[PDB]
Amino acid sequence: EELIKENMPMKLYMEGTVNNHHFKCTTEGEGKPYEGTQTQRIKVVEGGPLPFAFDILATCFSKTFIKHPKGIPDFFKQSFPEGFTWERVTTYEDGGVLTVTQDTSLQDGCLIYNVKLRGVNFPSNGPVMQKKTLGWEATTETLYPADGGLEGRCDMALKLDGGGHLHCNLKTTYRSKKPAGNLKMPGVYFVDRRLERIKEADNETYVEQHEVAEARYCDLPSKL
């Protein structure tokens, strides 16, 4: 927390297979963790060009850069210097499944992300393998305390070429590398996000992504 400055750089390494196509990516980026904004510049360094829509990788590329109001304890920033991990299964409504393991560490004042992933059963004539997608809609994730970690649940929608959407459901567990004590847990809360592709080149083997992410407790009145 202490260690997370108003400006922070990040670097990411990714290795994965989707429908039996192996690849690797690297990234460099920076953001403003307390403002909830970040940019990543992504290179497909192995296995490019990808025969699947780069969009399905977008949510793999940074929880430290969520704006948390003062009243919401920040699980992610609190976890440093030790860092944290996250694990996810994304299930697409046409049968695609993507599982991901991520490690987040802080090294020489830089955030370091290591990602491994496997995608299976994306339909050969579906929008993902035919690259007929056009980015993500804005979203709300709900985060729940669970045994000293957080569970995240989010329904997302991939925009399609003629209009319309392909839907998927994200189930994530976030785990701190810090011991149980010395972590103040939030209650149940929400993160609203807008992830946008800002630049791309060479059939998505270079991609620049921007994210804005802001946390909130539900502001609706309660009758108890």
> For the chain, what's the residue count?
224
Residue 62 · residue 40 · CB < 8 Å: yes
Residue 211 to residue 192: CA distance in whole angstroms: 10
- Ramachandran region, residue 146 (left: φ > 0; alpha: ψ -120 to 50; beta: rest): beta
Cα separation, 165 vs 104, in Å, equals: 31
Q: If you ran DSSP here, which 8-state letter would residue 206 be given?
A: E
Tell me the C-alpha distance between 154 and 223, whole Å.
Answer: 26
CATH number at residue 62: 2.40.155.10
Measured CA to CA, the distance from residue 1 to residue 159 in angstroms comes to 36
Phi first, then psi, for residue 33 (nearest 5°) are: -65, -30
Residues near 153 by Cβ (< 8 Å), separated by ≥ 6? 141, 142, 144, 169, 170, 171, 172
Range of the domain at 39: 1-224
Structure tokens at 84: 């944290």
CB neighbour class for 163 (10 Å; exposed up to 12, middle 13-18, buried from 19): exposed
Experimental method of this PDB entry:
X-ray
Backbone angles phi, psi at 54, to 5 degrees: -50, -30
Those residues with Cβ within 8 angstroms of residue 124's Cβ, 6 or more apart along the chain or in another chain: none
Query: What's the burial of 60, exposed, middle or buried (CB within 10 Å: 0-12/13-18/19+)?
Result: buried
When divided into structural domains, the chain yields a total of 1
89: CB partners within 8 A, 6+ apart: 97, 98, 99, 100, 170, 171
Contact at 8 Å (CB) between 8 and 39?
no
Q: Nearest CA to 109 among 35, 183, 2?
A: 2
